[PDB]
Design a binder for these strands. Structure first.
Length: 1095
DNA sequence: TTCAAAAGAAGCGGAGCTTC
């Protein structure tokens, strides 16, 4: 109550009166914010924050005094102090630009003079900054404390924002641009991942500014001002940065790409500092000075990151105690620099790292235009990765003499799907380059005898890094394969690394020696293996060799196998038993390992299996159209085009069709996760086109090396055996492209029909500019869709089983129906509140609701059970942050541009999201969380969602714990969890309360195609309750299967490599039984257990 | 309709329709 005179004492001269019922100009800053109970920011109360902080940053002594700490970060030395001095001089220029822009704004259209007359311009979308100005003679001026504090925030953001941005994928870019995901032009995604959208830039900037202001939002102030003022400030700071060239604004015209797309979309990119700029060694000095509890910082020694209370971007959802425990365990792990890898990276040098692991130096005219763009994006990813690692090493180097002795902690958070994600773009969990330089793994091994376990472990890690598939063969067979590699092809690289580990020197042909020796095995962890093997060779005491080399306990087809175990709800089938065996669940085979399975029982994993099913399904398709020669020819051309450019499609001379497990890897995965067939066809086409674009660079590179080469030899020389032999491949290519782009298959009445597009590919090929775009991509996609993907989809269903497919449909419908009601009720209750506000004279259209009001509405939906609980996890599928609820601008810059949509935390339609949320969450999500908190939880690992890096000392026990954690997560019942929540929803939902658009969306999920048209509320309600029943039955089934599976002897090795499977000790023995006998026995127990329930 | 985060710009006027 007396908070009023409290924030007034601090800002006594802001224009206007802090009373919403006052008649003149009202000051919405003092209305929106309060002094906090405990200090959040050290600039609160300061009359000149830029001056005060500049002085604080001017010496180590003055910094320590300002932050009230006895010692400052040692990275804050002389060179870095000088760079921050210069950056403080620059913040003064930003402050100066901001002041001139306010002056321009007050003058134009006499806004200042009208504001002075009583016009409420501080409530316009452009005028919310007038809430932090002060009267100055005949005009107004910024309150200096707020302006400068905001500039300090602007500077910190400028320093570290790019390194904290989300990665954008194809789907993201498709949503942003409004362009179909399957039709995105090459490198467009790259351009958008390189920039920030307006929303992206402004929201992160607004966050920082509001945090530096160090105040609390008033629960009863309108969001229009609580989000609005800091956003308006952010917008002006972005605008200033564009003037100063700290940020480059590029307005990307979508009509240059797709001619009827009228969206123009702004992209903002922060001008990078030099890699060797001292400030990179310590880029958080301002943050750590301004904030009492800084966010951005590195964690050295026993400085442990705090544990997040809520899910990542889901403040409505508290991390459960079990989850918090898991975050605590992972944050506690110490990581250490492996000096030799760092020294290797440095000695190779950024340029050679790029030549080796990226695209090297691009000759933009030996390159096809589209190929050149993926090449850029490849370099980008490696180079930022390199620079980021080296910035971190620069700060670690200051902490101590020996960088390998400095312990490093990483912050983590639980995501929406229950995964423990390391914060930051470039860390060990997320960046392969960094993963081999900063490691939690470490062991002291006795490698003096090649016959002991320590050496075997060592071999296992070398071989897995060297791309030998170690889960498919026993340790012994692995050992021999590794030896053949080390003694053969890898030897000259090994010799080179031996020398490197002696003199510190690399030859000038280092890239060629590495590249040649490694071939397709090339990777960052391979470089580690060559390093560790050569370090071993020259080691003085082999009996105590110290190494961070790891073995990853890696999930075998983890997602699909989890789904099959978690949500198959029928009787047991022998196909299921055989298939689930491919993912490490073995029945009646005590101690059986994945290595033994693959070597003696079944060499086909789930990917191979579906590929084989696709071959059958392709056969069936070719038969139903056996006489249709145009259709036969069209399938032949697709298969030919794939054969020409993809390694996984083999066409032999017999016409024989061999398909490798690889083509099915992504399509199997994303299919279980709700992906439609069209999106799959697109990705397939995208890999075909990518290889073609590449081959076009191969042409230019052979046309320059011998301008007499024939076209066919330039394009297919490296792929053919002769001159005329290459000629027929060129003939296949041109023919395939011709027929696949001029003719598409369409489904009519259940039958495929060929149709002309009239936009077939015609013309002499120009290898530099050559581009499949538009109506031709779509054509390829249509062919890919009906002749390959649809058979593949059938293959997948036959593989993972139709029961699973059925569960996931029901899960999808239920969570979708639920999210539709939530989203629609939320929007309506919002409109009801806004209709009240219109009677309030203090309220203006644009102010929107208060947080308290929004919280009330969010709470009024609890009886619809928006959350899903498991006991250890909480999922909020509908949860989102969107612009559709407020549907209005939040603020603009002082030039009437940079219009930021008012985004509100609110439920939105799930789509198919319920599927991967529950699968990933109760699958690998639950498993890793279990692995982190279980009794005897493995220490010193790096967990990467479905795989775990383990030090060579602990590979046996950690692996067994991992398979035990798998078993624990297989006791889960996600469909039950959805059931519990959906049934509560079903007894509180009023379907008549819904808008017609929401009522129609529900019809789509709950009804067959026919009943949609004109169905009553009671129709779609009766349908929505049918789904509940379906869920109830599935969940009852999963529950019993699980109990029954536990009564039987199981050996689980889903987290494979090491050969250490978990045994459940089921007492019922099913050894010496075929899958058919086993299925009969499990089903007997099933029907037994069913009658347990009834009676 | 795969998940892990959203997301057009800008004149005139003072919101929100409008044209690109």
């Amino acid at each position: 109550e007396e908070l009023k005179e409290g924030i007034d004492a601090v800002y006594p001269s802001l224009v206007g009166t802090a009373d919403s019922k006052a008649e003149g100009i009202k000051n919405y800053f003092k209305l929106s914010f309060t002094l906090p109970e405990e200090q959040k920011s050290r600039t609160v109360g300061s009359e000149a924050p830029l001056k005060d902080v500049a002085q604080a940053l001017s010496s180590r002594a003055r910094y320590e005094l300002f932050t009230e700490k006895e010692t400052a970060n040692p990275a804050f030395n002389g060179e870095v102090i000088k760079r921050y001095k210069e950056l403080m001089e620059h913040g003064e220029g930003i402050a100066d630009i901001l002041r001139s822009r306010l002056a321009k704004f007050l003058n134009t259209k006499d806004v200042g003079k009208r504001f002075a007359q009583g016009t409420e311009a501080n409530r316009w979308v452009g005028g919310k900054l007038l809430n932090i100005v002060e009267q100055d003679g005949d005009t107004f001026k910024y309150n200096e404390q707020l302006l400068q504090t905001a500039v300090l925030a602007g500077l910190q953001w400028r320093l570290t924002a790019t390194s904290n941005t989300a990665i954008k994928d194809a789907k993201d870019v498709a949503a942003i641009t409004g362009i179909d995901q399957a039709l995105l032009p090459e490198g467009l995604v790259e351009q958008f991942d390189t920039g920030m959208t307006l929303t992206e830039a402004v929201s992160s900037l607004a966050q920082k500014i509001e945090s530096y202001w160090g105040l609390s939002r008033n629960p009863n102030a309108p969001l229009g001002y609580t989000k609005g003022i800091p956003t308006a400030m952010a917008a002006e700071i972005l605008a200033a940065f564009v003037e100063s060239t700290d940020v480059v604004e590029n307005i990307v015209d979508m009509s240059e790409i797709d001619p009827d797309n009228k969206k123009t979309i702004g992209l903002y990119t922060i001008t990078e500092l030099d890699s060797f700029d001292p400030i990179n060694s310590f880029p958080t000095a301002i943050e750590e000075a301004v904030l009492v509890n800084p966010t951005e910082k590195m964690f050295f020694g026993d400085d442990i990151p705090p544990v997040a209370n809520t899910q990542l971007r889901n403040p409505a959802v508290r991390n459960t105690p079990e989850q918090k425990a898991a975050l605590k365990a992972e944050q506690a792990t110490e990581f250490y620099v492996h000096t030799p890898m760092v020294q290797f990276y440095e000695t190779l040098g950024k340029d050679r790292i790029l030549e080796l692991m990226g695209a090297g130096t691009l000759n933009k005219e030996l390159l096809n235009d589209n190929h050149a763009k993926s090449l850029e994006g490849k370099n980008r990813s490696v180079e930022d990765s390199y620079n980021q690692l080296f910035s971190v090493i620069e700060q670690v180097r200051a902490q101590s003499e020996d960088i390998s002795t400095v312990p490093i902690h990483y912050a983590y958070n639980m995501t929406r799907v229950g995964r423990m994600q390391m914060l930051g773009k470039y860390n060990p969990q997320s960046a392969k380059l960094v993963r081999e330089a900063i490691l939690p793994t470490k062991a002291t091994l006795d490698l003096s005898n090649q016959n002991n376990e320590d050496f075997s472990a060592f071999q296992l890690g070398l071989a897995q890094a060297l791309d030998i598939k170690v889960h498919t063969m026993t340790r012994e067979v692995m050992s021999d394969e590794l030896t053949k590699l080390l003694e053969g092809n890898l030897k000259p690289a090994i010799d080179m690394m031996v020398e490197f580990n002696t003199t510190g020197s690399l030859p000038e042909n280092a890239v060629d020696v590495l590249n040649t020796a490694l071939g397709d095995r090339k990777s960052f962890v391979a470089l580690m293996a060559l390093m560790e093997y050569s370090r071993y060779l020259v080691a003085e005491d082999k009996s105590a060799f110290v190494t961070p080399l790891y073995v990853e306990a890696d999930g075998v087809t983890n997602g699909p196998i989890n789904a099959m175990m978690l949500m198959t709800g029928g009787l047991f089938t022998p196909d299921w038993i055989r298939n689930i065996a491919k993912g490490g669940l073995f029945i009646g085979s005590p101690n059986k390992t994945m290595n033994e399975h693959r070597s003696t029982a079944d060499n086909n994993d789930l990917y191979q299996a579906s590929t084989n099913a696709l071959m059958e399904s392709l056969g069936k398709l070719r038969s139903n159209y056996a006489s249709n020669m145009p259709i036969q020819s069209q399938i032949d051309s697709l298969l030919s085009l794939m054969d020409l450019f993809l390694p996984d499609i083999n066409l032999g001379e017999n016409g024989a069709l061999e398909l490798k497990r690889g083509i099915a890897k992504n399509p199997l995965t994303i299919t279980i996760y709700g992906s439609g067939a069209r999106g799959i066809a697109g990705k397939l086409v995208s890999s075909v086109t990518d290889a073609i674009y590449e081959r076009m660079s191969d042409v230019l590179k052979a046309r320059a090396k011998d301008p007499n080469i024939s076209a066919a030899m330039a394009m297919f020389g490296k792929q053919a055996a002769s001159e005329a032999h290459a000629e027929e491949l060129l003939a296949r290519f041109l023919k395939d492209m011709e027929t696949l782009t001029s003719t598409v298959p369409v489904k009519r009445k259940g039958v495929l029909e060929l149709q002309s597009t009239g936009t077939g590919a015609k013309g002499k090929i120009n290898p530099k500019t050559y581009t499949i775009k538009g109506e031709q991509l779509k054509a390829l996609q249509e062919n890919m869709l009906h002749f390959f993907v649809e058979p593949l989809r059938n293959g997948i269903t036959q593989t993972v089983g139709e029961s699973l497919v059925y569960s996931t449909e029901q899960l999808q419908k239920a969570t979708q129906i639920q999210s539709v009601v939530l989203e629609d009720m939320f929007k309506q209750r919002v409109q009801e509140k806004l209709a009240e506000k219109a009677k309030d004279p203090t309220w203006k259209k644009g102010d929107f609701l208060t947080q308290k009001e929004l919280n009330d509405i969010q709470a009024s939906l609890n009886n619809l059970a928006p959350m899903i609980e498991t006991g250890s996890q909480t999922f909020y599928i509908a949860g989102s942050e969107n612009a559709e609820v407020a549907n209005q601008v939040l603020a603009t810059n002082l030039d009437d541009r940079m219009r930021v949509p008012m985004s509100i935390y609110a439920p939105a339609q799930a789509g198919v999201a319920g599927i991967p949320f529950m699968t990933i969450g109760t699958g690998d999500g639950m498993m890793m969380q279990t692995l982190s908190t279980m009794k005897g939880a493995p220490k010193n690992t790096l967990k990467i969602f479905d795989g775990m890096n383990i030090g060579l000392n602990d590979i046996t026990d950690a692996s067994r714990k991992a398979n035990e954690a798998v078993y624990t997560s297989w006791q889960g019942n996600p469909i039950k969890n959805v059931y519990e929540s959906y049934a509560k929803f079903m007894k509180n939902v009023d379907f008549s309360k819904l808008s017609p658009e929401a009522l129609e969306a529900i019809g789509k999920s709950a009804l067959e195609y026919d009943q949609r048209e004109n169905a009553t509320v009671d129709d779609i309600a009766n349908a929505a309750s049918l789904i509940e029943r379906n869920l109830r039955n599935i969940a009852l089934g999963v529950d019993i299967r699980h109990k029954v599976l536990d009564k039987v002897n199981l050996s689980i090795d889903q987290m494979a490599a090491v050969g250490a499977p978990y045994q459940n000790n089921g007492k019922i023995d099913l050894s010496n039984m075929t899958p058919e006998q086993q299925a009969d026995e499990l089903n007997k127990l099933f029907r037994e257990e069913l009658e347990a329930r009834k009676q």
